[PDB]
């Protein structure tokens, strides 16, 4: 069977099912992948200067390394051994009830005040005659920090005092999930579990992965280091 | 209709008067956006950017487009006019004709040169048969490789006529020489003549292949252009 | 003018030697683009310290205001350019200048949390109790942003 | 529509780019997010790659990223096409007696010319220089 | 036009451009397709293109009325237009190749530095490139520069106080100033879009923002002025990314008498001295060359090795092959002479021409060495006797092919008409090469055969 | 769903058919739009 | 193998009596104990 055509046929059918799936499932991204079930290699990442935690390393891999490895030809699937950061709003129900607020109020405020708005232009087409000025209008943009999320205004009280999001929740960068935690020889680590695409050459892909990893190393922060705790390709290379 | 959109009910006042959409806005049929102002010699303009389909004849398609526009002519409103600011077809039509003229003239020039030296019409005919058999045969081999008649493949052939003409001239001249020097009859003269050159002609085939075939194995855009010349010149030279 | 717009480009890019030549050739320091920005606005924004100093020597309006009332001191105070803030203030920049929104250099410096720039603006006599169109002080901004270091200084 | 470069990049371009995984024979990927509300992501493949497979693989990964895009972008559509600069010819259509604006001509061409040219023998693709009509509601804030 | 320039300003320049072509070039120019608001460098009101369509090749006689000469006069004439970069240029034969000597460099944010720090690093790289004009020329960014933009801060506290929802605010602003595609309608049996937007006169200037009202919960209309505050800032109207990371494309080319490879090596050297977290990469034509250049030596080698081995088998000799193979320069010298003295280039038509010229000279040489060698082997003749007899027998068929073929390409050389660029590139290198290949080979091939047989006795 | 043939032809069938141009080896294309709001567009290709 | 799980029954009548919507109940329970992906933000230039 041609794996390319199998993927196309499977996904044509999934696309019929997609709008019948819950909105939360659609927004987590559904994926159709044509890979070997087994791992080709694990690319580990550690900090030799103990400067970055497991969570920091996992976020670095997720944000600066994974995407390019994922896009590399022959890479059917990439498992991050850890999580990319998300803005975690850790809600307090005691402080929420005190200001007569719910998670529904929190979610609506985050939607309203963490928004990237299309606001049009000064002097936009079609213009009036004699227009000299043409500039983009910039309204609200995405929040970039814990400080800005804390600064979100949920509610103004009758006596004029402000209920900010930091008043009802601990706010921090932290994993999308906290399920995967990796160690390399006992010390904190993250990594990529790379599964070979169906019909792809193991050795050529491994070479391509190592080529792409070489392009990232120069721009690593201090301490970060690639280790190679699992690789099926060296045996193939040496045994031949 | 604009009329129906104008009548859209926005609200009903206390007194009973109705606020329609035409009361708070100007309703017109216009463009989807006003970023581009297209003009042709000052007059307002639009157009169709037309592209050739995979494996389509550029000259047929152009003629077919013109036939379809001709059928649309009588139904146009007042003031509407078709214009052809960009068209590759006149240029391609000339490009192919100038190559075909060169190949025809090349065979005519051989006839004249063959007659100047050998001075009998039977000797002049043999290349006049053999060269167009090879040039015509090259198209069949171009069809085997799934190539088009294009600027590269056609100039590929006029670069090759030096080789195609020589193969014809070498065989006939060497029969005419052997007859003149040894006084053999044509049949025996040809057996001896070919006996002298047939090993060398196979050698020249293998040498010219070694020159041209490696052009085909260059990579990227540059490599794809050389491959047009490579398959064409190797194919014409091999048939010759 | 021709040189006015070359000085607008040159002041933005930080091309010190081109500004020197344009200053010699009498390029208009008061030249302004569509939004009303002088070279001094553009120098104050992109943090080009030497050009700010050159433009002020060549009689540039230190309190020039754009089409929304913002001065070069607003831009320098907002984008954390400490040396330019000090130079503008030495050459008589209005420390209590208000844009169309009532926003002072102190408000902008407070909002982006530039401590040294808030302390300089206070030395040159910044109205700590100056209110924008929404009645907000630099203190109100420091409380809302949760900058505790900044909250101390503005308490007087 | 109405989006600045950063708004386009940070809600559309990054979200699509992050989902271009598991496609075969991709050499490199480049994108422009600009202030006319437009994004354009060009994925360039290895010479000898099947362009139809490269296009369906890109399209398929896009479809699964579509729920993550803004409601306005989902509505407009996101187009996946094979990259060709070479036109066979450009047919221009003009109005010589001032009765028709460029928007009037473009609507005529869309409605009465484009489809029949698309259907013509050997025509691989037809691109309209302008748009078909839109019902434009031109709002007045004083009356509103 | 300069950044922040309007559609109307660009329309006025395009009108002058159109006017020049229909006035100064009325004998040549059939039409001008003036496309306001479209450039390849980027979209926007401040850019436009005029696609000039000429009259028939017959109606434009001589070099004065060709695309070379009109492009020259046009660019030169438009020099004087104030507040506008306006230049004419011919199309490339194939659009996708760009230029030889030219490169395509990607400067890459590899460490989340941001737009402005990548801009500074790009300026730093552009500055250094300018300080090497001996090696690099026209080292420029392919993208757009930052422009004034109107930052408007919705005050969340005052919006909640007055009972005005943020969605009503953002929708009011976005719909009016940006436009909003609402839904579809059927116009004469064709589905078509419905857009709401402000009439032009209420979305032009910062004052107009205050004329827009939003209904609060309690039914009172609140202008934007009441809950918003605006200031001018700079920001990008075009943000580039390469392989998922923020980037800035830098175009440039090798300086006269330099190879692209050298120019690229300097760009890599200068790029290594840029700030922390600023990477680089080669794309398009540069990525293509960087891989196609690695290939060449192998294919040149494999070609030369197999030619030798074939001749070795033909002649049953390891030494004699060299007598044929030494002919190669005799053809190539005349090609380079004819090309150089006509002011043409080392293009693909010239290059493939060298192989056909080398092939035909190699062919002629093979039959001279074959006749000579067989006269020695079969008829026991002497080296010089056999060589002198060989070249005597081969003189006629060599002069015949050459006379026929040099007359065959003569029209392509002198061709001035449509497609003459390619015809000249084919004809000139072949005609020149064939003159030297013929003239020299008849005198030099015997020399090569004799010298080689003597050296390996 | 719930759209008549004429509506479904205008909004769906023609919109799809407009784009089905310039596909490799297309012999002919037949389609129907009906009162239940269903569209079927069958493209038939050259043998092999 | 099967495992102990906390079955919670939302009394529809009592909710309607107190004037609490089922959406608010299910969002409050789901967001708090399960987690809710609300929207995207930008962390050092990358969408997260
Ligand atoms: C008269 C002359 O000069 O050559 C004419 C004559 C021409 C060589 C023609 C192209 C082509 O059919 C030729 C073939 C081999 C086509 C296949 C057969 O049917 C042959 C029996 C026929 C004989 C000559 C002919 C009919 C010419 C062309 C090319 C026309 C094509 C384009 C793209 C403009 C030409 O006019 O250049
Ligand atoms: C004597 C040496 C013999 C060897 C040389 C052989 C040369 C062969 C070259 C291919 C010629 C055939 O190519 C064929 O030409 C005809 C007639 O021009 C073209 O016909 C098309 O273009 C012409 C010119 O615009 C139109 O008038 C015509 O309506 C249209 O269908 C075909 O699209 C093309 O496929
Ligand atoms: C994977 C395989 C690849 C193989 C590639 C090798 C290519 C070799 C180049 C071609 C060489 C041709 O080789 C040549 O053939 C002719 C056949 O007519 C041989 O035959 C020879 O013997 C006859 C006997 O009557 C003589 O009259 C005449 O001199 C000659 O033809 C030559 O001895 C040989 O030199
Ligand atoms: C008789 C011996 C054969 C010599 C010719 C072999 C070289 C050609 C090999 C090849 O395939 O290259 C293709 C190449 C692609 O750009 O085409 C070319 O550029 C033309 C080859 C360059 C000129 C050769 C003469 C050198 C004199 C020292
Ligand atoms: C040596 C002559 C062999 C000719 C073979 C022709 C193959 C036909 C290919 C058809 N097509 C162009 C559609 O692929
Ligand atoms: C009639 C003989 C033709 C032989 C030409 C050989 C071309 C090889 C093609 C190489 N490549 C796979 C890269 O296309
Ligand atoms: C491609 C060149 C290969 C070189 C082979 C050298 C053979 C020389 C031997 C001479 C013996 C008479
Ligand atoms: C007989 C001549 C064939 C030459 C083959 C060259 C192929 C090179 C592949 C890298
Ligand atoms: C790969 C090149 C092979 C050439 C062999 C030459 C042998 C010469 C021995 C005298
Ligand atoms: C170059 C053409 C030679 C032919 C001379 C005339 C033949 C009788
Ligand atoms: C006897 C000649 C053999 C030719 C090999 C291709």
From Swiss-Prot, chain B:
Induction: Positively regulated by MarA, Rob and SoxS transcriptional regulators (at protein level). The chain crosses the membrane at residues 96-115, 125-144, 151-172, 198-216, 225-240. Disruption phenotype: Loss of susceptibility to contact-dependent growth inhibition (CDI); inhibiting cells still contact the target. It is found in: Cell inner membrane. Residues 116-124, 173-197 are cytoplasmic. Residues 145-150, 217-224 are periplasmic. Belongs to the resistance-nodulation-cell division (RND) (TC 2.A.6) family. AcrA-AcrB-AcrZ-TolC is a drug efflux protein complex with broad substrate specificity that uses the proton motive force to export substrates. (Microbial infection) Involved in contact-dependent growth inhibition (CDI), acts downstream of BamA, the receptor for CDI. Its role in CDI is independent of the AcrA-AcrB-TolC efflux pump complex. Homotrimer, with large domains that extend into the periplasm, interacts with AcrA and TolC. AcrA may be required to stably link this protein and TolC. Interacts with AcrZ. Part of the AcrA-AcrB-AcrZ-TolC efflux pump. This is Multidrug efflux pump subunit AcrB.
From Swiss-Prot, chain E:
Induction: Positively regulated by MarA, Rob and SoxS transcriptional regulators (at protein level). Residues 312-321, 367-395 are cytoplasmic. The chain crosses the membrane at residues 295-311, 322-341, 348-366, 396-415, 422-441. Residues 1-294, 342-347, 416-421 are periplasmic. It is found in: Cell inner membrane. Disruption phenotype: Loss of susceptibility to contact-dependent growth inhibition (CDI); inhibiting cells still contact the target. Belongs to the resistance-nodulation-cell division (RND) (TC 2.A.6) family. Homotrimer, with large domains that extend into the periplasm, interacts with AcrA and TolC. AcrA may be required to stably link this protein and TolC. Interacts with AcrZ. Part of the AcrA-AcrB-AcrZ-TolC efflux pump. AcrA-AcrB-AcrZ-TolC is a drug efflux protein complex with broad substrate specificity that uses the proton motive force to export substrates. (Microbial infection) Involved in contact-dependent growth inhibition (CDI), acts downstream of BamA, the receptor for CDI. Its role in CDI is independent of the AcrA-AcrB-TolC efflux pump complex. This is Multidrug efflux pump subunit AcrB. It comes from Escherichia coli (strain K12). The gene is acrB. The chain holds residues 578 to 1034 of 1049 of the full protein.
């Amino acid at each position: 069977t041609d794996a390319d055509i199998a993927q196309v046929q499977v996904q044509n059918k999934l696309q019929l099912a997609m709008p019948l799936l819950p909105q939360e499932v659609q927004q987590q991204g559904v994926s159709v992948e044509k890979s070997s079930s087994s791992f080709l290699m694990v690319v580990g990442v550690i900090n030799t200067d103990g400067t970055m935690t497991q969570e920091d390393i996992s976020d670095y891999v997720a944000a600066n390394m994974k995407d390019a490895i994922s896009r590399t030809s022959g890479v059917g699937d990439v498992q991050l051994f850890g999580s990319q950061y998300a803005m975690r709003i850790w809600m307090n129900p005691n402080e929420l009830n005190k200001f007569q607020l719910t998670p529904v109020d929190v979610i609506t405020a985050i939607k309203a005040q963490n928004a990237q708005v299309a606001a049009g232009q000064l002097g936009g087409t079609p213009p009036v005659k004699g227009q000299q000025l043409n500039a983009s209008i910039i309204a609200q943009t995405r929040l970039t920090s814990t400080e800005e999320f804390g600064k979100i205004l949920l509610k103004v009280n009758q006596d004029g005092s402000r209920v900010l999001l930091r008043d009802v929740a601990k706010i921090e960068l932290g994993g999308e999930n906290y399920d995967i935690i990796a160690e390399f020889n006992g010390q904190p680590a993250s990594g990529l579990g790379i599964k070979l695409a169906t019909g792809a050459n193991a050795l050529d892909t491994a070479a391509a992965i190592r080529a792409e990893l070489a392009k990232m190393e120069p721009f690593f922060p201090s301490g970060l280091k690639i280790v190679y705790p699992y690789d099926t390709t060296p045996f193939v290379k040496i045994s031949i | 209709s604009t009329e129906e959109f104008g009548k859209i009910l926005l609200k009903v006042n206390q007194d009973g008067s109705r606020v329609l959409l035409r009361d708070v806005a100007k309703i017109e049929l216009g463009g989807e956006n006003y970023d581009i102002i297209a003009e042709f010699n000052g007059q307002p303009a639009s157009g169709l950017g037309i592209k050739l389909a995979t494996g389509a004849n550029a000259l047929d398609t152009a003629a077919a487009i013109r036939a379809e526009l001709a059928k649309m002519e009588p139904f146009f409103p007042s003031g509407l006019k078709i214009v052809y600011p960009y068209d590759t077809t006149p240029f391609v039509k000339i490009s192919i004709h100038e190559v075909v003229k060169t190949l025809v003239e090349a065979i005519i020039l051989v006839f004249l040169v063959m007659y100047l030296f050998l001075q009998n019409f039977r000797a002049t005919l043999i290349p006049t048969i053999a060269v167009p058999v090879v040039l015509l045969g090259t198209f069949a081999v171009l069809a085997a490789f799934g190539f088009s008649i294009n600027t590269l493949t056609m100039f590929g052939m006029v670069l090759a006529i030096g080789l195609l003409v020589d193969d014809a001239i070498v065989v006939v001249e060497n029969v005419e020489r052997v007859m003149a020097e040894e006084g053999l009859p044509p049949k025996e003269a040809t057996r001896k003549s070919m006996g002298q050159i047939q090993g060398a002609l196979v050698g020249i085939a293998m040498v010219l292949s070694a020159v041209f075939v490696p052009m085909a194995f260059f990579g990227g855009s540059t490599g794809a252009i050389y491959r047009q010349f490579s398959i064409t010149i190797v194919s014409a030279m091999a048939l010759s | 003018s021709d040189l006015g717009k070359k000085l607008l480009e040159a002041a933005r890019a930080g091309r010190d030697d081109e500004v020197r030549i344009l200053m010699a050739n009498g390029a208009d320091v008061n030249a302004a683009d569509v939004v009303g920005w002088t070279p001094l606005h553009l120098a104050a924004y992109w943090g080009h310290l030497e050009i700010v100093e050159v433009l002020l020597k060549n009689g540039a309006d230190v309190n020039a205001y754009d089409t929304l009332g913002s001065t070069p001191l607003h831009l320098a105070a907002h984008f954390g350019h400490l040396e330019i803030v000090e130079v503008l203030l030495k050459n008589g920049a209005d420390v209590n200048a208000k844009d169309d929104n009532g926003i002072t250099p102190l408000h902008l410096a407070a909002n982006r949390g530039h401590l040294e720039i808030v302390e300089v603006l206070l030395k040159y006599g910044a109205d700590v109790n100056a209110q924008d169109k929404f009645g907000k002080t630099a203190f109100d901004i420091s409380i809302n942003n949760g900058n505790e270091d900044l909250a101390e200084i503005l308490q007087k | 529509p109405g989006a600045d470069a950063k708004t386009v990049q940070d809600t559309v371009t990054q979200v699509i780019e992050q989902n271009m995984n598991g496609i075969d024979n991709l050499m490199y990927m480049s994108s422009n997010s600009d202030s006319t509300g437009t994004v354009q992501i060009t994925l360039t493949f290895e010479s000898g790659t099947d362009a139809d497979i490269a296009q369906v693989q890109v399209q398929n990964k896009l479809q699964l990223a579509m729920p993550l895009l803004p409601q306005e972008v989902q509505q407009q559509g996101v187009s996946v096409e094979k990259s060709s600069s070479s036109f066979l010819m450009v047919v221009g259509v003009i109005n010589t007696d001032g009765t028709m604006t460029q928007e009037d001509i473009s609507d005529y061409v869309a409605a009465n010319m484009k489809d029949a040219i698309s259907r013509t023998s050997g025509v691989g693709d037809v691109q309209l220089f302008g748009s078909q009509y839109a019902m434009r509601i031109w709002m007045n804030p004083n009356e509103l | 036009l300069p950044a922040g320039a309007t559609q109307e300003r660009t329309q006025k320049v395009l009108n002058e451009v159109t006017h020049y072509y229909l006035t100064k070039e009325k004998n040549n120019v059939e039409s001008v397709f003036a496309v306001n608001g479209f450039g390849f460098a980027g979209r926007g009101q401040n850019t436009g293109i005029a696609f000039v369509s000429l009259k028939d090749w017959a109606d434009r006689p001589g070099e004065e009325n060709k695309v070379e000469a009109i492009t020259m006069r046009a660019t030169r004439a438009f020099s004087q237009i104030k507040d506008a970069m306006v230049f004419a240029f011919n199309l490339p034969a194939i659009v996708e190749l760009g230029t030889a000597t030219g490169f395509d460099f990607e400067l890459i944010d590899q460490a989340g530095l941001g737009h402005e720090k990548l801009t500074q690093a790009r300026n730093q790289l552009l500055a250094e490139a300018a300080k090497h004009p001996d090696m690099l020329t026209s080292v420029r960014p392919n993208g757009l520069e930052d422009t004034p933009q109107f930052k408007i801060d919705i005050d969340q506290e005052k919006a909640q106080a007055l009972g005005v929802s943020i969605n009503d605010i953002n929708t009011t602003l976005g719909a009016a100033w940006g436009g909003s595609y609402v839904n579809d309608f059927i116009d004469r049996g064709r589905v078509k879009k419905v857009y709401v937007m402000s009439e032009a006169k209420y979305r032009m200037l910062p004052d107009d923002i205050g004329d827009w009202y939003v209904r609060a919960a309690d039914g009172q209309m609140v202008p934007f002025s009441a809950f918003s505050s605006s200031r001018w800032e700079y920001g990008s109207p075009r943000l580039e990314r390469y392989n998922g990371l923020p980037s800035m494309e830098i175009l440039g080319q090798a300086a006269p008498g330099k190879s692209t490879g050298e120019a690229m090596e300097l760009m890599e050297q200068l790029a290594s001295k840029l700030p922390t977290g600023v990477g680089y990469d080669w794309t398009g034509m540069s990525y293509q060359e960087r891989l196609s250049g690695n290939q060449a030596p192998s294919l040149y080698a494999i070609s030369l090795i197999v030619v030798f081995l074939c001749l070795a088998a033909l002649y049953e000799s390891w030494s004699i092959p060299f007598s044929v193979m030494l002919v190669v320069p005799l053809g190539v010298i005349g090609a380079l002479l004819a090309a150089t003295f006509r002011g043409l280039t080392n293009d693909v038509y010239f290059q493939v021409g060298l192989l056909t010229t080398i092939g035909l000279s190699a062919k002629n040489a093979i039959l001279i060495v074959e006749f000579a060698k067989d006269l020695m082997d079969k008829e026991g003749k002497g080296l010089i006797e056999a060589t002198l007899d060989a070249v005597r027998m081969r003189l006629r068929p060599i002069l015949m092919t050459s006379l026929a073929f040099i007359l065959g390409v003569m029209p392509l050389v002198i061709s001035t008409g449509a497609g003459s660029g390619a015809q000249n590139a084919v004809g000139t290198g072949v005609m020149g090469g064939m003159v030297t290949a013929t003239v020299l080979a008849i005198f030099f091939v015997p020399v090569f055969f004799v010298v080689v047989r003597r050296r390996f006795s």
